[PDB]
C-alpha cells in the first residue's frame, strides 16, 4: 500500500534517534543514501489512522564549507518524498534550533514541532510558552521527553491531524529582497511550488551555491539581481540573516523565560 511518509529533521543531538526508536522499535531498515556512504535508516509505526514510514534524516543546523549531512538533508526536504516532517527541537536551545525550523516553514512543508528535552530546559530553569510558539510558527508544537516517552501518544495524535501550516508571517525581509526573490522565482520551473521558488530566490540572493541547481534559468539572472541590490542596500547577503535572527530573537523573548 501507499504509506504516509514522514521526515524526522532536527539539529545534531536533539534526541532525534531516541525518538526514532521510541516510534519504530524493531521495525526498521538500515541502508545508505544514493552515491554516498552516509547511512540511511527508516522505520515503520502505526497511529490510529495511518501506517507511517519514518525516514531518520541526519542532523543539520540549517539547510545551507558544508557537510554531506547538511546536503543529504536539504535534498530530501526539497524532494517531495515526505508528506510531512517532524522537527525535533532541543528546548534547552530554542534560539539555536529554531533557525532550521524557520527555513522549513518558509518552504511551507507541513510539519509538527517535537519540542524535546524539556527536562533539561527545566533543569536549566527555562519554560516555553508552547501555545505562543505554536501561533508564531503557525504549526503544531508538541512537548516531549524522548528518553521517557512523554507525549509520544500526543505526537501520534498530531500526526493524524496533519494539516497545511497556517500561512502566518515569520521573518520580515526588506521590500527589495522580496521583490528580487520573487523576480528570480518567476523564471524558475513552474512545477515547483511558488512558496519554494520564493525561498530558493532568497537563498540564491544570500549566496547559497547549491540552491542554484533547482533554480533552472534563474541562476543566470542572479548577477543582475545582486548588482541592483548593492545600490539600494549595504551587504544584502547580511541583511537576510539579520531578518531571521531578529525574528527568532523576538519570538524567543516571548516564548522562553
Ligand atoms: N537528558 C535527556 N536526554 C535526552 C532527552 N531526549 C533525548 N535525550 C538524549 O540525547 C542524547 C542524544 O542522542 P540522540 O537521541 O541519538 O540524538 P541525535 O539527534 O540522534 C544525535 P545525532 O544527530 O548525532 O545522531 C541521547 O543520549 C538521549 O538520551 C531528554 O529529555 N533528556
Ligand atoms: Mg541520530
UniProtKB/Swiss-Prot annotation:
Induction: Iron uptake is repressed by the global regulator Fur in presence of Fe(2+). Induced by hydroxyurea. GTP 3 binds at residues 56-59. Changing residue 149 to A: GTP hydrolysis rate 1.8-fold slower than wild-type. It is found in: Cell inner membrane. Residues 1-257 are annotated as: NFeoB, GTPase protein domain, binds GTP but not ATP. Disruption phenotype: Poor uptake of Fe(2+). Residues 1-257 are cytoplasmic. GTP 2 binds at residues 35-39. Contains a guanine-nucleotide-specific nucleotide-binding site (about residues 1-276) that shows slow GTP hydrolysis. When a non-hydrolyzable GTP analog binds to the trimeric N-terminal domain, it induces a structural shift which opens a pore. The isolated N-terminal domain (residues 1-274) forms trimers. Transporter of a GTP-driven Fe(2+) uptake system, probably couples GTP-binding to channel opening and Fe(2+) uptake. A guanine nucleotide-binding protein (G proteins) in which the guanine nucleotide binding site alternates between an active, GTP-bound state and an inactive, GDP-bound state. This protein has fast intrinsic GDP release, mediated by the G5 loop (about residues 149-158). Presumably GTP hydrolysis leads to conformational changes and channel closing. Belongs to the TRAFAC class TrmE-Era-EngA-EngB-Septin-like GTPase superfamily. FeoB GTPase (TC 9.A.8) family. This is Fe(2+) transporter FeoB. It comes from Escherichia coli (strain K12). The lineage of its organism: Bacteria, Pseudomonadati, Pseudomonadota, Gammaproteobacteria, Enterobacterales. The gene is feoB. The chain holds residues 1 to 261 of 773 of the full protein.
Amino acid at each position: 500500500m501507499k504509506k504516509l511518509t514522514i521526515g524526522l529533521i532536527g539539529n545534531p543531538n536533539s534526541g532525534k534517534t531516541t525518538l526514532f526508536n521510541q516510534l519504530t522499535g524493531s521495525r526498521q531498515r538500515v541502508g545508505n543514501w544514493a552515491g554516498v556512504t552516509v547511512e540511511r535508516k527508516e522505520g515503520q509505526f502505526s497511529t490510529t489512522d495511518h501506517q507511517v514510514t519514518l525516514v531518520d534524516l541526519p542532523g543539520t543546523y540549517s539547510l545551507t564549507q558544508t557537510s554531506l549531512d547538511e546536503q543529504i538533508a536539504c535534498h530530501y526536504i526539497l524532494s517531495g518524498d515526505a508528506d510531512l516532517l517532524i522537527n525535533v527541537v532541543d528546548a534547552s536551545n530554542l534560539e539555536r534550533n529554531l533557525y532550521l525550523t524557520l527555513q522549513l516553514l518558509e518552504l511551507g512543508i507541513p510539519c509538527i514541532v517535537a519540542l524535546n528535552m524539556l527536562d533539561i530546559a527545566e533543569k536549566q530553569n527555562i519554560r516555553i510558552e508552547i501555545d505562543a510558539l505554536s501561533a508564531r510558527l503557525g504549526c503544531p508544537v508538541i512537548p516531549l521527553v524522548s528518553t521517557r516517552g512523554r507525549g509520544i501518544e500526543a505526537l501520534k495524535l498530531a500526526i493524524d491531524r496533519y494539516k497545511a501550516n497556517e500561512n502566518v508571517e515569520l521573518v520580515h525581509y526588506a521590500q527589495p529582497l522580496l521583490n528580487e526573490a520573487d523576480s528570480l522565482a518567476k523564471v524558475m520551473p513552474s512545477d515547483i511550488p511558488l512558496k519554494q521558488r520564493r525561498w530558493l530566490g532568497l537563498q540564491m540572493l544570500e549566496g547559497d551555491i547549491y540552491s542554484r541547481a533547482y533554480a533552472g534559468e534563474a541562476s543566470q539572472h542572479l548577477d543582475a539581481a545582486l548588482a541592483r541590490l548593492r545600490n539600494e542596500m549595504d551587504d544584502p547577503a547580511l541583511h537576510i540573516a539579520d531578518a531571521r535572527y531578529q525574528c527568532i530573537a523576538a519570538i524567543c523573548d516571548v516564548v522562553s523565560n
